[model samples]
Target chain A: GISIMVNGCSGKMGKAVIKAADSAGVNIVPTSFGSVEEAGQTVEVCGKEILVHGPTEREKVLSSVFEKYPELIVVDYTIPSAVNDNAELYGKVGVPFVMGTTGGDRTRLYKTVEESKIYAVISPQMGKQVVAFLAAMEIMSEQFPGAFAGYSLEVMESHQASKLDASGTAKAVISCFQKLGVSYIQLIRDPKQQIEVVGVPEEHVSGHAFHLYHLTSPDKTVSFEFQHNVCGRSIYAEGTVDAVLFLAKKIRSKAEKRIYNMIDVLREGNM
Target chain B: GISIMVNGCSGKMGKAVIKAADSAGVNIVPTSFGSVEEAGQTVEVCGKEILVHGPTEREKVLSSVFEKYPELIVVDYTIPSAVNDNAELYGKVGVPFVMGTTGGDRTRLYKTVEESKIYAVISPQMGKQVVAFLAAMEIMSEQFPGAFAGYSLEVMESHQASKLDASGTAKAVISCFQKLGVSYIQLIRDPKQQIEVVGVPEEHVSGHAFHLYHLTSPDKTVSFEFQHNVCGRSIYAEGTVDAVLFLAKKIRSKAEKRIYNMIDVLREGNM
Candidate 1:
């Protein structure tokens, strides 16, 4: 019975979310968005015909859809460049939403939503298991501030070749370790090196994200390590739908909290 | 045609080495060392019965072993505490050897071989793949100095619960990362947390060594990671046998370099 509009419906993540929502028995819109080139073209997403519109007409088309379905919640999984501007639009339009897209002026994005009292969930990572690890990382950072204060941190992240940006999830992790003070990141995106050096399976060459963090003591006598790997898009898809479901529940309850991150949704503990 | 005197054959690594040597069709020695209680006991290794003797009789026993198999190579896998003493005795006796033991005065151990000019291989890790990773790390540190200059490092290693010490191999990795500046290490020996936080498989808990390294810039804008997991003891076993073969070739050539490490053994490229 919950209807959610997945922005950037032409992208890999956006399409995956559509499939996940379909499997969850949620309503699928006959509409989606793409670049100007996709205008007047219809594509099949989760077995439904969706007419694509360019960003120029986004506000008009979205308003019409929102009017028809007032219960709609927007889920944004677009390109990184679209993050801040899209969020600003969603905020101005006063549409309750979930932002899964990573990158942009994150601080301004947070302020924008908080100031608008918009209902939302924002996170760089969406996999449940990965979220748990991130939250555990957060708890450890909070409970043990400066736990790695003098330690050195070397982070390496490998994603599919088409993933032009370093993992936002990895950067999210980097922020916590910085409470300890350190820098210098090595981002490996070359598919050949990933398969040869990182032990990434060849079949997953097109779709995987593997992250590793190595910490060494000042004397180099002791060390610490953390890693998380995702083989495909399904984990994020599942978590995205879960967030949509979680956000819908919060709206129904008229929750006092208008803006939340994945950690918040994670703590609430819903399917 | 090669004989390996597995000095500390009653220990886990020693036993594994013996099996690997046997499978390689090398002559397995009938002698081994053990604690006082295991001294009078006979243990079957690689389908052969070998008598275990206490440390008190090692010099006398080893003397006879030397006479019986003058071409033998001593493989030491004893406790870290025994490393220096064992090396001293081996030097005095002039028995060419390989030290797989983890710790001692590493510099003295190297000097011991240099001064004595005794054929030897000393390494904290013996797995060929692991040695390759270490070599790769070294290459990166040397070629790209300051690549992680302002980065922080955290290292965590998990092995079977029976392991009482942090992995020496992990310490070696920490040293290389420090060339880029800084270090802080945290060891994870707790099994439950290893399974929960480290993504270690349940079946591998009894026989695994997992190492992880994470780095982040001081501002946490970027991240890097490296990880390698060993599923069982077999990789080390296979590598130990390879080391023996390489040492035999070195002795025959009367090579100018008498002391080597796993990295040296790996460089010869013998499977």
Candidate 2:
């Protein structure tokens, strides 16, 4: 069935959504607010032909796109600044949506979506593994409060050279460690090509992500190290798509209205 | 009182014993097989003056050093290959000794030490913190058997560039993880001038050590990281000295003959 509409279809996250949805066999109706000539074309994504439409008026574009496909669900992988306005628009039409944009005016946006009675899954990032990481951190703090006591900690994180911000998931994970009395300092390394997050340097790569947490003491007598490495962002993309389908099922079953994050998905028992 | 002879007096471990013994107000009679003139001088170590003697034949050195310092306890911090020979010499003279080297033939060494009827404490790395790290690993493995069940496991260890072999302590800790069903793959980076074991690259200077255990899954969906960092080798040195001192007390009190490790020191309940 024709089921998915990827908003902001010209952006980085939009392209990710298109790929993820298609891989999951979810049909996509790609739409953008850019030029019609630039947007309204058939883009081959994940071996499926996804019809793209945009550069038209906002309401007209949404109405025309929805009229052609009445049972559509919107997956908003747009910029944070665009989320509130987009949510208001999607809410008015009562279309179920998933918002994966960070830095949005979440309060007002969520209110609008709820008032319109449309199901929405909103999160800054939706990697299923990230959710698991958070859960594990929580368990560690609760279970092992003094595990790393007296050890000084430092965190080293790497991303592609094009990545401008430290990973939000890394920040979140550190917060969990903090609650467990594990102190940490962060080092952001931008690799022009490939950088091993496992704290090793390598050559010839477009991008890489790595994190190292080093712990020491006042006398510099003893130490402990923890690290993580990521080669690509596909893991997050796959997780986001899984979250979308999960929300889709909830909506179809008329599940109760509530806020959901990746944690909720993880707690649902299956990976 | 002049209480002990520092074996391997010209070596690093021997120097540590001299400093520790001086601080404890025990007189140290240093002896080594180095150049005779150099060995016979009065050595200033950790602000204490100690008579040194060496470059003599092993049996001759032992007899002369022991006769001059009749109440001496031999602090054997030499290479493992030298320990059994030292044990035989010390036993013949009715002097108690401590064997702090690793990698000797354990069974033969133990039997030889027993036959000597002299007090001895045999150990691998004697750092108190390394002992603690082993204890912590064992405790965690037993308590959290399923904690990392679905997570992929990797271990990265860092040490001084001069450290030639794989970390004996890390390998011991890995056994704990193995018992819990977590297979550990060791990641050894190329030898650098100063290796930061903490998994943080920026702080690779100095003699810091660290161990990082990372767990992830096939889908890259979840992760759990555990780390410990250490600086300097003093903790091991101090711990070993304490073990020797403890053995000394035990011998004076005619305590039972038994195998012991850092756990016994910890059980004494002093950090």
Q: Choose the strongest candidate by lDDT.
A: 1
Worst 10 residues of 2 chain A by lDDT: A197-206
lDDT, each prediction: 0.67, 0.59
Q: Which runs in model 1 stand beyond 4 Å of their true positions?
A: A1-160, A163-271, B55-60, B104-112, B149-154, B159-167, B181-184, B189-207, B216-223
lDDT tens per residue, model 2, A1-271: 5377776566666677777777778777644453445466766555555566553467676877778887677887767677887888787767777777777787888777777777777777665544454555555555444444445556666544125233676677677566545556434554422323234432221125555555555455455445445445555667677667767767767888645676565544332
Could you say which candidate leads in DockQ?
Answer: 2
Residue ranges of candidate 2 with Cα displaced over 4 Å:
A30-44, A47-49, A55-71, A138-150, A158-167, A182-207, B1-271
Tens digits of per-residue lDDT, candidate 1, B171-227, equal: 767887786455555556643222211231211121245565666544333334455
Each model's interface RMSD (Å)? Answer: 17.1, 8.4
- Give RMSD to native, each candidate: 16.9, 10.7
DockQ of each: 0.03, 0.11
Per residue, candidate 1 scores C-alpha lDDT tens digits across A94-160 of 7888888878889998988888887899977676545554444554454334434455677666655
